[PDB]
């Protein structure tokens, strides 16, 4: 039933966790919360134990806490970080204040991988394949990551990859132009844009659009993919945005094969399909998986989709204690994955 908890202060923060978690070592903090690496004696895995900071300090924060826990509890896929555990030392709703989330502490992120070796084209195929496999799953539940970048991808020594740190709000180099300047509502293919940016960088050893501010980055993007045509302009809601875009000197799309010389032409072809300015015309994660670049990895019987994910809570208008109570319910109903 309820584990035995033990209590310790580490770096001016109290941690009260089940004794199954041992040898906690602080590894960073922030506005989100605060994290320790630990050894999970039940699974034998190294884990990140995140203690949320001020999870219920306002309506806004309480709803965000609920949103995060709902999302993490739903994700069950080999290429997406899942929730190993969630707990509170509280014995009742009335003493409920703290929430702890436990996830696998896997390998290193994609940046650190690149720092210690040169990837082969085979590596890039397999890494991007797994990102897209994860995205097919996420997108099939109408979840959008929103914040894909190398530091949000975990990789182990077998080159196995997981997507983590979903964007929970409702650098900038990997972000689709339409969300960066708020041109329109996000669709799932903002994540596909990010993948294109990540893949380009894995192939070339250079950030694709390293802009210093929003305008500089837009200009680098438009130089590659060309300025918007009338069809895309029609979909941009802000009159000011439209006026600004129309103010730019027109530019043709570049030939990507000139931009990525010496790379696998099938890789370049996939990039052309991911980095299209109009999001409705970008390749989807499902379609990209069937792309010839991934022929050695693609298995249509092993690219699963997700259960539907009910996000109707997003339009509820509730009291702080109501979000807190819904959160508590989710802590209580949590069932760990098979050991």
């Amino acid at each position: 039933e309820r584990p035995t908890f033990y209590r310790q202060e580490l770096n001016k923060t109290i941690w009260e966790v089940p004794e199954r978690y041992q040898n906690l070592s602080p590894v960073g903090s922030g506005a989100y919360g605060s994290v320790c690496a630990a050894f999970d004696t039940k699974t034998g895995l190294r884990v990140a134990v995140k203690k949320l900071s001020r999870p219920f300090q306002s309506i806004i924060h309480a709803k965000r806490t609920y949103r995060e826990l709902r999302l993490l509890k739903h994700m069950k896929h080999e290429n997406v970080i899942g929730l190993l555990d969630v707990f509170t030392p509280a014995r009742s709703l009335e003493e409920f204040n703290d929430v702890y989330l436990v996830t696998h502490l896997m390998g290193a992120d994609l940046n650190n991988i690149v720092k210690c070796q040169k990837l082969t084209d085979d590596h890039v195929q397999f890494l991007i394949y797994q990102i897209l496999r994860g995205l097919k799953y996420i997108h099939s539940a109408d979840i959008i990551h929103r914040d894909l970048k190398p530091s949000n991808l975990a990789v182990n020594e077998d080159s196995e990859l997981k997507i983590l740190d979903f964007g929970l709000a409702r650098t900038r180099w990997y972000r689709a132009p339409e969300i960066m300047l708020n041109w329109m509502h996000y669709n799932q293919t903002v994540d596909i844009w990010s993948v294109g940016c990540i893949m380009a960088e894995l192939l070339t050893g250079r950030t694709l659009f390293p802009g210093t501010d929003h305008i500089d980055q837009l200009k680098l993007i438009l130089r590659l993919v060309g300025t918007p045509g009338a069809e895309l302009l029609k979909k941009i809601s802000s009159e000011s945005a439209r006026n600004y875009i129309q103010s730019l000197t027109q530019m043709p799309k570049m030939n990507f094969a000139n931009v990525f010389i010496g790379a696998n032409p099938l890789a370049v072809d996939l990039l052309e399909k991911m980095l299209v300015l109009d999001s409705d015309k970008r390749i989807t994660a499902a379609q990209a998986l069937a792309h010839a670049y991934f022929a050695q990895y693609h298995d249509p019987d092993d690219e699963p989709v997700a259960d539907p994910y009910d996000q109707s809570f997003e339009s509820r208008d509730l009291l702080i204690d109501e979000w807190k109570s819904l959160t508590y319910d989710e802590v209580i109903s949590f069932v760990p994955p098979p050991l």
Binding site: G107, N112, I113, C116, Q117, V155
Partner: peptide, 8 residues
């Protein structure tokens, strides 16, 4: 599966 060095 290709292999990788994990820092460090």
């Amino acid at each position: 599966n290709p292999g990788l060095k994990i820092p460090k």
